[PDB]
């Protein structure tokens, strides 16, 4: 359990290969330019190896830098990544991230990433070794990801090197946790990479927990999260003014519980969730979107039409309960987004086109100040199981709902409305390796409130870094570097 | 909303009814003699856009002009060629072909090729009749080629004319010129170069000129004539240009992370010429395979003369972290035009001085020419020569610490074993320019030269004309240029 103090890149290199379980390699204040930190030794579960700033906020990794956590039970802590300059020809989308986690049982905590450089990669990945071994049980927490001007997601959690859509072997469950992180990143063109990707296709098992994160103008592309694996849980996250949706994109049996999808202006279309596949639970989520996304279907919750189990898998046989759809400007639930394109897709792959069906809709509260201009649903409800739901405020198709009335001011909790009742659910399965009693959590309802910066920030960092969250634009130097990235892509 | 129009008359029928957030989309075609005067204004969040529906398919031709008089206006993806303005209605120092009278305006993606024979700039920021100065405008992703007329390509104005004796400062402009391409043929005399900012030492510019590509910008001796204080030239590439980027009038200017480069030794290339004080010349890479004989054969020229005058002494400035790589000439000339400046000093009854108090630190001086290469001309004793570095035999290199490369093809002195950046402190930022000047100095030469694909309008594949390509103008343009030159010689 020895603290080992170092003050330069060369002094780091001199110690890294001698670290033992319980050692903390403490970096003195300074700039560590072009640091290529490759940690191959391992800690133990009770005595991790920690590599940390002595004073968070005073240690910068800059220049042509990277981190590879290849041992197990390693912690990278309180590092600030900025003023980067990697060789853009040595990095690509779908490769390792600026910090790449190759070993299991590893943690990246309190680290800040702001407009790092022009090399396209994620900021953090879990990456397979060259022999194909999948890292498991890692944690990314209390990190800050802002002003990303490069392609690929902010974070990729991988269990294959590339998508393998036809494989009969399942991608191995990963059991990672991403929690208390902050995301705010500017729009990029096309399928440019979003906030988080988990796995690649329907035949991948995730079993990762994404909880307590704060996304504020996470605007990189259409997908805030592109969840592309089975059995992931999105719990207690706050999505504020985000131009995109949290998606169950590939993989059945995913869960979104007690999140907030909120907005404080009507300047851009905000989301929201877009759902493909079946056996999902969408429960206890609060939606208040003052403007929704026209290109997707102008809704808070979108349920995909298409062929079952396909690349655009039909949304069906799922549970939508105890959510609060509060004064959305758009449909609350759209059961026919992108209808014509999906019909064309089903024809392209020679598969039966279907509309969403057997989705149980119960215990939800719909409220509006917009009168009959607000239409809660688009699409075919009779193919689904519409049980008792509740509404406050006159809206179109009001007769579907039981009238209720608020008793408190400013409550996010439908249980504070007189007449409201929670859904009766039973036999809900917990997810292996995620220590959450899902049925009990469904039955508690919406007891939370939106996260703020102080709820997630690294303890040493006072203000949100960067410029997109604060100003809605980039600082001048970053704008110039971003224009270089975009021109190189257009001409690639 | 999007408003489609397909003729000059249809443009005039809509332009005075535009509202914030409207886009006036021009259908493909030739808009001859269009005099586009945009008086309405957009808002910060919702500009008014006038744009080609299809970039490269709309042409403004004939006796044309654009006046952007409202605010929060954008002129986008217009191609200016085949012009025919009345040559008696336009003069140097007047408005440009596109004249920006209002603040918060943008001209983007517009291409200008050998437009006509009327002497004017291609784009100006122009004062209104009553004297109001436009501020916070942007000219970006524009292409300026084959200019056969007098005056600069772009003028940024804060006065109708130089008011050299005034104590009221010319108002700060805060414009940005970025991702533009310049390639223009030689004109005789003081014919107007690429960009002019302001008119004299008592003008404040605070303009950002960044990420531009000058390839055979050969119009005259000055690629940029920077004639106002506190302008920043950041990350521009100057390639085979027969001229220099100048700090001509006005103290406290910055040249950061630029490339002054060459790919042949056919003509004298530049380079920077510096008048005045309190400048920062940092992180610039120079490789000039031939230098300009008439100016003093150097990469960087520091002006001698009286302080604060029409030929202001270069003094009390910082020259750090630059890479003077195999220049054919002096790396720094501290006595250019020596006898002419002594005669000027006597004509104005002001004390002649040589450059002094210039701190030269952290620069890398390299050469393949041996002792034939001399890095400095003039008086070093008057200046603050700190730790500098060198690679390759050259004259007087005992002044330098030897360093060695670790890779091939690097523009970055930090890749040389033994090299150290300058120790700088208390460098302040310039108001209204969102760049951390001290941090940028300390990061050094991390970039590489721009190429055409880094700056071009996304719709335009090839550089217009062949001046950059072959030093030639097309036949019609050569005939029109001869008319301009004959009219000038006889005026």
């Amino acid at each position: 359990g020895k603290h080992i103090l170092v003050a330069s890149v060369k002094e780091v290199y001199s110690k890294v290969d001698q670290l033992k379980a319980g050692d903390t390699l403490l970096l003195k204040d300074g700039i560590y330019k072009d640091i290529q930190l490759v940690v191959k030794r391992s800690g133990s579960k009770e005595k991790p190896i920690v590599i940390a700033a002595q004073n968070g906020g005073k240690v910068f990794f800059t220049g042509d830098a990277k981190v590879e956590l290849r041992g197990e039970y390693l912690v990278l802590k309180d590092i600030y990544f900025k003023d980067g300059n990697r060789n853009v020809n040595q990095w690509k989308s779908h490769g390792p991230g600026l910090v790449a986690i190759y070993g299991s049982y590893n943690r990246v905590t309190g680290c800040v990433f702001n407009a790092f450089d022009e090399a396209n990669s994620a900021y953090i990945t879990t990456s397979l070794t060259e022999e194909g071994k999948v890292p498991k049980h890692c944690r990314i927490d209390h990190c800050v990801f802002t002003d990303k001007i490069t392609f690929d997601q902010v974070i990729n959690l991988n269990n294959r090197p590339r998508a393998d859509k036809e494989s009969k072997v399942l991608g191995e469950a990963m059991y990672h946790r991403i929690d208390h992180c902050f995301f705010s990143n500017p729009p990029k063109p096309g399928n440019a990479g979003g906030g988080i990707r988990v796995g690649y296709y329907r035949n991948d098992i995730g079993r990762c927990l994404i909880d307590s994160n704060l996304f504020v103008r996470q605007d990189s592309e259409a997908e805030i999260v592109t969840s592309k694996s089975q059995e992931n849980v999105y719990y207690g996250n706050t999505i504020l003014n985000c131009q995109g949706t949290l998606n169950f994109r590939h993989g059945d049996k995913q869960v979104a519980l007690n999140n907030f999808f909120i907005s404080t202006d009507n300047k851009y279309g905000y989301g929201g969730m877009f759902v493909w596949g079946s056996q999902h639970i969408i429960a206890n989520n609060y939606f208040n979107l003052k403007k929704t996304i026209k290109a997707r279907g102008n809704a808070a919750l979108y349920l995909n039409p298409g062929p079952e189990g396909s690349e655009h898998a039909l949304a069906f046989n799922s549970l939508i309960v105890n959510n609060f759809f509060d004064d959305n400007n758009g449909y609350d639930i759209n059961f026919e987004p992108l209808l014509e394109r999906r019909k064309e897709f089903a024809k392209e792959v020679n598969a039966e086109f279907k509309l969403p069906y057997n989705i149980t809709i119960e215990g939800n509260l719909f409220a509006s100040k917009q009168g009959d201009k607000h239409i809660p649903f688009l699409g075919n409800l009779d193919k689904n199981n519409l049980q008792n739901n509740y509404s406050f405020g006159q809206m179109a198709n009001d007769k579907l709902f039981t009238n209720v009335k608020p008793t408190t001011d400013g409550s996010y909790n439908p249980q504070s409305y007189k007449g409201y009742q929670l859904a009766n659910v039973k036999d809900i399965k917990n997810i292996e390796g995620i220590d959450l009693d899902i049925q009990n959590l469904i039955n508690k309802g919406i007891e939370g409130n939106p996260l703020t910066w102080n709820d997630v920030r690294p303890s040493w960092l006072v203000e949100i870094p960067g410029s997109y969250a604060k100003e809605g634009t980039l600082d001048q130097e970053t704008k110039i570097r971003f224009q270089r990235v975009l021109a190189r892509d257009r001409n690639n």
Side-chain angles (χ1 to χ4, degrees), chain A residues 1 3-9 11-17 19 21-27 29-46 48-57 59-81 83-91 93-129 131-165 167 169-266 268-293 295-339 342-343 345-346 348-349 351-372 374-398 400-404 406-408 410-417 419-420 422-425 427-428 430-491:
Chain A
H3 276 217
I4 307 169
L5 265 165
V6 291
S8 74
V9 173
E11 283 176 27
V12 170
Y13 294 161
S14 83
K15 300 283 174 198
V16 67
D17 285 336
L19 299 175
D23 287 342
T24 296
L25 186 63
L26 279 175
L27 274 67
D29 302 0
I31 295 161
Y32 292 76
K33 191 166 187 185
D34 310 322
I35 184 166
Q36 300 274 316
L37 179 59
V38 177
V39 193
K40 295 183 178 66
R41 312 257 307 181
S42 296
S44 73
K45 176 198 181 63
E46 300 211 314
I49 295 172
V50 174
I51 296 182
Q54 178 175 34
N55 298 302
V59 168
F60 301 95
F61 281 16
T62 71
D64 185 7
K66 74 176 176 184
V67 182
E68 308 185 342
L69 297 191
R70 289 188 172 266
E72 301 185 336
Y73 307 102
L74 308 177
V75 180
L76 179 74
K77 177 169 174 179
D78 297 336
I79 307 302
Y80 200 133
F81 292 84
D83 289 337
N85 185 40
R86 292 175 293 170
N87 186 327
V88 306
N89 312 296
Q90 299 184 325
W91 299 83
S93 293
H94 305 273
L98 173 60
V99 172
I101 309 173
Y102 294 98
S104 294
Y105 311 107
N106 286 335
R107 179 182 180 190
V108 175
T109 183
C111 291
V112 177
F113 298 80
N114 182 62
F116 187 70
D117 68 7
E118 297 166 30
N120 299 303
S121 76
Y123 281 165
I124 308 177
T125 57
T126 63
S127 287
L128 279 65
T129 63
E131 293 80 19
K133 189 182 172 53
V134 176
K136 295 171 190 184
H137 302 283
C138 295
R139 185 177 179 206
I140 298 165
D141 66 276
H142 296 96
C143 291
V144 178
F145 310 103
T146 52
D147 292 7
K148 185 173 196 284
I149 52 166
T150 47
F151 292 94
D152 216 345
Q153 276 67 230
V154 177
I155 298 171
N156 292 324
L157 300 182
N158 299 290
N159 53 8
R160 294 188 208 253
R162 291 304 306 250
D164 191 347
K165 302 189 199 263
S167 179
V169 62
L170 298 174
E172 294 166 26
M174 293 177 277
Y175 305 111
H176 303 310
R177 181 178 181 212
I178 302 170
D179 67 274
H180 302 88
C181 292
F182 182 85
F183 297 81
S184 185
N185 291 290
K188 289 177 286 181
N191 293 318
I196 302 171
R197 171 181 55 75
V198 191
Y200 273 121
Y201 200 65
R202 294 190 39 82
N203 55 358
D204 290 328
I205 309 298
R207 294 180 182 169
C208 294
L209 175 65
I210 293 86
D211 72 272
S212 312
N213 298 289
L214 173 57
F215 303 83
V216 176
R217 305 206 185 270
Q218 169 55 42
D219 296 345
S220 297
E221 59 137 276
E223 306 189 86
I224 303 168
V225 175
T226 187
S227 195
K228 293 182 161 179
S229 47
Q230 303 184 34
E231 296 180 2
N232 297 301
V233 173
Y234 295 87
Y235 180 52
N237 299 283
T238 288
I239 291 83
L240 172 63
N241 300 326
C242 287
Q243 299 191 70
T245 49
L246 190 164
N247 292 350
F248 290 168
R249 174 65 187 92
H250 294 311
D252 298 332
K253 302 171 185 173
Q254 307 198 56
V255 175
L257 197 53
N258 287 91
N259 304 281
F260 287 86
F261 295 100
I262 52 169
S263 56
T264 55
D265 65 58
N266 64 341
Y268 310 106
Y270 302 131
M273 294 181 56
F274 205 119
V275 175
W276 292 253
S278 64
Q279 296 184 35
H280 302 306
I281 300 180
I282 295 163
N284 304 339
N285 300 287
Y286 176 84
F287 300 85
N288 168 234
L289 304 172
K290 295 166 164 62
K291 186 171 185 56
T292 51
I293 302 161
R296 300 274 154 210
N298 279 114
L301 175 60
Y302 300 91
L303 300 173
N304 187 68
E308 295 181 13
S310 70
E311 171 79 76
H312 276 293
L314 177 68
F316 77 104
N317 186 27
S318 296
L319 191 57
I320 297 171
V321 293
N322 300 346
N323 303 286
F324 190 174
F325 295 95
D326 190 15
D327 208 27
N328 295 306
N329 179 10
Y331 305 104
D332 297 311
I333 312 176
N334 184 336
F335 299 80
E336 58 166 58
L338 303 172
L339 191 56
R342 292 298 191 259
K343 285 171 173 165
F345 168 80
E348 275 155 25
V349 301
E352 184 181 347
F353 174 84
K354 300 199 189 172
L355 288 181
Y357 73 95
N358 288 347
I359 293 170
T360 293
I361 305 146
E362 187 175 337
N364 298 282
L365 176 57
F366 300 86
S368 188
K369 297 170 161 287
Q370 300 158 58
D372 280 2
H374 178 69
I375 306 168
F377 311 122
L378 185 67
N380 195 321
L381 275 289
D382 294 324
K383 286 177 173 298
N384 294 293
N385 181 31
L386 190 66
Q387 292 289 321
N388 283 156
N389 297 280
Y390 304 88
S391 72
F392 170 60
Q394 220 285 326
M395 69 185 74
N397 304 128
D398 216 286
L400 292 174
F401 309 135
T402 296
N403 296 324
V404 302
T407 69
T408 315
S411 173
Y412 299 94
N413 188 352
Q415 292 168 68
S416 70
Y417 283 65
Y420 173 84
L422 296 157
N424 290 318
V425 310
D427 293 339
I428 303 295
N430 293 329
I431 284 170
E432 181 70 43
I434 302 183
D435 186 25
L436 292 172
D437 182 332
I438 297 181
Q439 192 155 335
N440 195 233
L441 293 173
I442 291 169
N443 283 332
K444 293 187 196 191
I446 303 183
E447 299 182 332
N449 52 272
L451 288 164
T452 68
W453 171 239
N454 288 334
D455 296 321
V456 307
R457 71 185 178 80
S459 56
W460 55 260
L461 181 60
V462 178
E463 297 300 313
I464 294 166
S467 165
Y468 191 69
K470 173 163 159 283
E471 309 278 340
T473 182
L474 301 168
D475 62 67
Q476 185 64 262
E477 179 189 347
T478 297
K479 282 198 182 134
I480 293 165
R481 297 196 75 190
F482 191 25
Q483 309 173 265
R484 281 302 261 280
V485 171
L486 297 172
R488 185 172 161 252
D489 173 76
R490 282 191 304 266
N491 288 286

